[PDB]
Amino acid sequence: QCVNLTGRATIQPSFTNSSHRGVYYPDTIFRSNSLVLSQGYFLPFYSNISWYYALTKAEKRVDNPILDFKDGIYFAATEKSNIVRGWIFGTTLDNTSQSLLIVNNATNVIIKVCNFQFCYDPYLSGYSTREFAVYSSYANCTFEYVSKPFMLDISGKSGLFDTLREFVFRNVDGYFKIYSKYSPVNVNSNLPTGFSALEPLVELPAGINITRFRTLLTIHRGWTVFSAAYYVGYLAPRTFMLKYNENGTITDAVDCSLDPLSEAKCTLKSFTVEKGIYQTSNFRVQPTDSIVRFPNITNLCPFGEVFNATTFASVYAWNRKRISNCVADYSVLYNSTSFSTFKCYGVSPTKLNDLCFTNVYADSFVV
Amino acid sequence: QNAQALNTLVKQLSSNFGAISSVLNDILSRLDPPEAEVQIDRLITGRLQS
Amino acid sequence: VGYQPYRVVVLSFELLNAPATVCGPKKSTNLIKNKCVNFNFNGLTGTGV
Amino acid sequence: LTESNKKFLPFQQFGRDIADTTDAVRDPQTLEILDITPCSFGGVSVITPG
Amino acid sequence: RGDEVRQIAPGQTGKIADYNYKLPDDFTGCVIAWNSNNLDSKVGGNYNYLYRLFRKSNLKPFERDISTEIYQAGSTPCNGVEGFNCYFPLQSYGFHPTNG
Numbered sequence: 001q002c003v004n005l006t007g008r009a010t011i012q013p014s015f016t017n018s019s020h021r022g023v024y025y026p027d028t029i030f031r032s033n034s035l036v037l038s039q040g041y042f043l044p045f046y047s048n049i050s051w052y053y054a055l056t057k058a059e060k061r062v063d064n065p066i067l068d069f070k071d072g073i074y075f076a077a078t079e080k081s082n083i084v085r086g087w088i089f090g091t092t093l094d095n096t097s098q099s100l101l102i103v104n105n106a107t108n109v110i111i112k113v114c115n116f117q118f119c120y121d122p123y124l125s126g127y128s129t130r131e132f133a134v135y136s137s138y139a140n141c142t143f144e145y146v147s148k149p150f151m152l153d154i155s156g157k158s159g160l161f162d163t164l165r166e167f168v169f170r171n172v173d174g175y176f177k178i179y180s181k182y183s184p185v186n187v188n189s190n191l192p193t194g195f196s197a198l199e200p201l202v203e204l205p206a207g208i209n210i211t212r213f214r215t216l217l218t219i220h221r222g223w224t225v226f227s228a229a230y231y232v233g234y235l236a237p238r239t240f241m242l243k244y245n246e247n248g249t250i251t252d253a254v255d256c257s258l259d260p261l262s263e264a265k266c267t268l269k270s271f272t273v274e275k276g277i278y279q280t281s282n283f284r285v286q287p288t289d290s291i292v293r294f295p296n297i298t299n300l301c302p303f304g305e306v307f308n309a310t311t312f313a314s315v316y317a318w319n320r321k322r323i324s325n326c327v328a329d330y331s332v333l334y335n336s337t338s339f340s341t342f343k344c345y346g347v348s349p350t351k352l353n354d355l356c357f358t359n360v361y362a363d364s365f366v367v
Numbered sequence: 368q369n370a371q372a373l374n375t376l377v378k379q380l381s382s383n384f385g386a387i388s389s390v391l392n393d394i395l396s397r398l399d400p401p402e403a404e405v406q407i408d409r410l411i412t413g414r415l416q417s
Numbered sequence: 418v419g420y421q422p423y424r425v426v427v428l429s430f431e432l433l434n435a436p437a438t439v440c441g442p443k444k445s446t447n448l449i450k451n452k453c454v455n456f457n458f459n460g461l462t463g464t465g466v
Numbered sequence: 467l468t469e470s471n472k473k474f475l476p477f478q479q480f481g482r483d484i485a486d487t488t489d490a491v492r493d494p495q496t497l498e499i500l501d502i503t504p505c506s507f508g509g510v511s512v513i514t515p516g
Numbered sequence: 517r518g519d520e521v522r523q524i525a526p527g528q529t530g531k532i533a534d535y536n537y538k539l540p541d542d543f544t545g546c547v548i549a550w551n552s553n554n555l556d557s558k559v560g561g562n563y564n565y566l567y568r569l570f571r572k573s574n575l576k577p578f579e580r581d582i583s584t585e586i587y588q589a590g591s592t593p594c595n596g597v598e599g600f601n602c603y604f605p606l607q608s609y610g611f612h613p614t615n616g
């Protein structure tokens with residue numbers, strides 16, 4: 001049902017830092033008993049981590065905001081009694097565009113890329129159970145996937161958290177990759193400090209554009225929520241040094257951008273450095289902004305007029321004309337010609353939108 | 368001798384080594400990546416031999 | 418097909434360093450400095466400050 | 467090919483060596499691990515008079 | 517279409533390669549095509565095959581667009597109606613058995 005929730009005390013997240021968690025496996029090549037340097041979108045060490053709560057004291061607190069999904073995220077959740085049960089991925093989160101829904105009910109995890117109409121306040125509920133109050137209809141649908149669950153029954157009550165669940169979500173080449181690790185913890189009110197490596201879980205082919213995401217929470221329903229918390233981090237392009245063992249599992253890693261000591265370790269390709277003075281390189285000031293500066297020409301080149309002529313030329317008397325002071329937009333001919341031959345020699349055809357030429361000549365004939 | 372060696376090492380950066388251009392910037396500007404790998408590899412081999 | 422006419426247009430490009438006359442439809446952002454960035458000046462790319 | 471005492475993961479098929487070499491391969495039909503050794507022996511010296 | 521099969525390749529440009537289907541630059545596999553004028557052409561015209569003509573930007577490799585929202589091809593914003601300078605983004609192929 002499409003029902004708003006009442007009695008929540010606003011969304012106000014706290015912040016923390018993730019010491020060494022979030023290391024996963026780049027690419028898919030098998031490696032064992034070696035040290036490699038890899039460039040990829042990792043979660044940098046000691047990066048700020050958004051913290052959200054879910055508890056009742058008799059003011060309720062349910063944190064399900066809409067967050068950005070840029071280059072992938074890190075998701076961790078210390079939990080007791082399994083309040084967190086799924087996520088929503090998409091770009092507009094309505095009927096206009098397709099969205100990805102990951103939901104775990106009492107026995108199975110249900111994944112389907114579909115065209116949902118989500119409500120203002122999506123959430124699940126359980127008495128006994130009474131769930132699926134997050135959408136109204138989905139209509140045209142593309143993908144479906146059911147496998148073994150990750151989360152446990154929503155019932156229960158204790159005094160301390162018991163399990164920590166970590167997830168890494170990525171979206172490359174039309175593939176939704178998921179990495180996970182499940183560990184038992186006895187922490188009270190914080191994210192644990194330590195190193196974690198996440199193994200591949202699924203490789204769902206979705207083929208959708210994902211920019212925004214949100215979490216799905218479970219209420220007990222005059223409704224109450226058991227104590228739970230989840231943490232959000234953002235991946236950034238870094239260079240990491242990873243160590244593989246004989247099983248092909250990562251056991252240690254260093255972030256080559258954290259500090260000068262990690263820089264020296266990454267430069268020397270070793271996890272330990274002897275006493276002395278070492279020449280380091282590339283202190284990792286990686287750029288994060290891209291700028292473009294182009295001239296003030298705005299009128300479009302007369303490709304339609306050139307291609308629309310009644311007669312072109314004879315091949316022995318081919319006509320040559322110069323094109324200048326315009327914008328070369330080949331997309332305006334897509335409804336007219338459908339070029340049967342398009343071959344470029346000095347440039348790549350995909351780089352034409354990024355290039356500016358001093359002068360251009362056009363030769364026309366019919367063969 | 369030492370100064371001349373360093374100066375020659377610097378001046379060797381303008382060699383094409385068989386690529387379209389010796390400037391790395393105007394290879395990634397004009398060529399799509401999988402086609403640009405060939406030129407980049409030639410430049411890497413030459414500059415690594417130097 | 419093979420005895421039917423085909424209209425052939427061949428374009429010759431000239432980069433040079435003179436002011437550009439034909440450009441792509443890319444949109445221009447505002448300029449920032451004193452910061453290591455990726456830039457694109459008339460099709461010439463790079464990284465620096 | 468010979469019989470090997472190495473233990474593979476239940477879903478593994480190949481075993482790689484330090485110098486990016488194939489060490490042991492699991493037979494697809496009879497699920498046993500066979501180690502691979504080159505048949506060329508290095509370290510043969512020929513002692514001859516003229 | 518017959519003249520757009522060359523666009524099913526890594527690194528190509530065109531409406532097919534920019535608006536409805538793109539291949540990754542590191543693609544590993546094979547591309548297979550064959551003429552199907554025998555059972556995909558109808559005497560009156562087969563208009564059940566559709567392609568996208570307008571999009572705000574090119575799509576990523578192996579990405580799919582399903583949305584059918586009106587495309588704003590003019591300065592003034594439009595509504596669910598096409599009207600002027602705003603078009604339905606999807607157009608239908610025209611397949612006749614006598615087509616060249």
Ligand SMILES: *[C@@H]1O[C@H](CO)[C@@H](O)[C@H](O)[C@H]1NC(C)=O
Nearest residue numbers: 001002003004005119120121
């Ligand atoms: C929930 O509240 C919002 C505004 O606070 C409103 O727009 C929306 O319609 C409400 N939900 C339902 C199901 O009416």
Ligand SMILES: *[C@@H]1O[C@H](CO)[C@@H](O)[C@H](O)[C@H]1NC(C)=O
Nearest residue numbers: 016017018019046190192193
């Ligand atoms: C990272 O978090 C731990 C746990 O709260 C904290 O002790 C440590 O100081 C944090 N790191 C930094 C650099 O402050």
Ligand SMILES: *[C@@H]1O[C@H](CO)[C@@H](O)[C@H](O)[C@H]1NC(C)=O
Nearest residue numbers: 014015016017047048049050
């Ligand atoms: C961590 O980053 C967030 C991002 O907005 C910021 O609000 C917070 O103040 C930062 N905390 C620290 C300790 O730098």
Ligand SMILES: *[C@@H]1O[C@H](CO)[C@@H](O)[C@H](O)[C@H]1NC(C)=O
Nearest residue numbers: 094095096115116117139140
């Ligand atoms: C999505 O929901 C809205 C509101 O109920 C409706 O107007 C729209 O037609 C729906 N989309 C589809 C494709 O049915």
Ligand SMILES: *[C@@H]1O[C@H](CO)[C@@H](O)[C@H](O)[C@H]1NC(C)=O
Nearest residue numbers: 105106107108109110129146
């Ligand atoms: C969970 O979802 C699956 C869908 O495959 C369904 O078969 C099953 O009955 C559901 N169980 C509950 C308790 O909702």
Ligand SMILES: *[C@@H]1O[C@H](CO)[C@@H](O)[C@H](O)[C@H]1NC(C)=O
Nearest residue numbers: 139140141142581582583584
């Ligand atoms: C969308 O739904 C309509 C009606 O169910 C159907 O005719 C059409 O083929 C669907 N489109 C896609 C892309 O699934």
Ligand SMILES: *[C@@H]1O[C@H](CO)[C@@H](O)[C@H](O)[C@H]1NC(C)=O
Nearest residue numbers: 245246247248249474475476
């Ligand atoms: C990983 O390697 C250890 C030895 O270091 C071995 O005991 C263990 O069984 C291996 N993992 C699995 C899943 O077998």
Ligand SMILES: *[C@@H]1O[C@H](CO)[C@@H](O)[C@H](O)[C@H]1NC(C)=O
Nearest residue numbers: 304305307308309335336337
């Ligand atoms: C050529 O131009 C005329 C008038 O400008 C126009 O009616 C016609 O559609 C054009 N031809 C093509 C193929 O666009």
Ligand SMILES: *[C@@H]1O[C@H](CO)[C@@H](O)[C@H](O)[C@H]1NC(C)=O
Nearest residue numbers: 334335336569602603604607
């Ligand atoms: C594209 O050309 C066809 C030719 O039949 C025409 O019907 C259609 O309206 C054109 N589309 C646009 C957006 O002009």
Ligand SMILES: *[C@@H]1O[C@H](CO)[C@@H](O)[C@H](O)[C@H]1NC(C)=O
Nearest residue numbers: 492493494495496497498499
């Ligand atoms: C494969 O088939 C052969 C021949 O029937 C048999 O000897 C062998 O045990 C089979 N292996 C497996 C794994 O089924």
Ligand SMILES: *[C@@H]1O[C@H](CO)[C@@H](O)[C@H](O)[C@H]1NC(C)=O
Nearest residue numbers: 091209210211573574575576
């Ligand atoms: C994904 O959706 C956002 C939403 O505005 C859009 O800006 C972006 O261009 C889309 N990406 C692609 C590759 O189409």
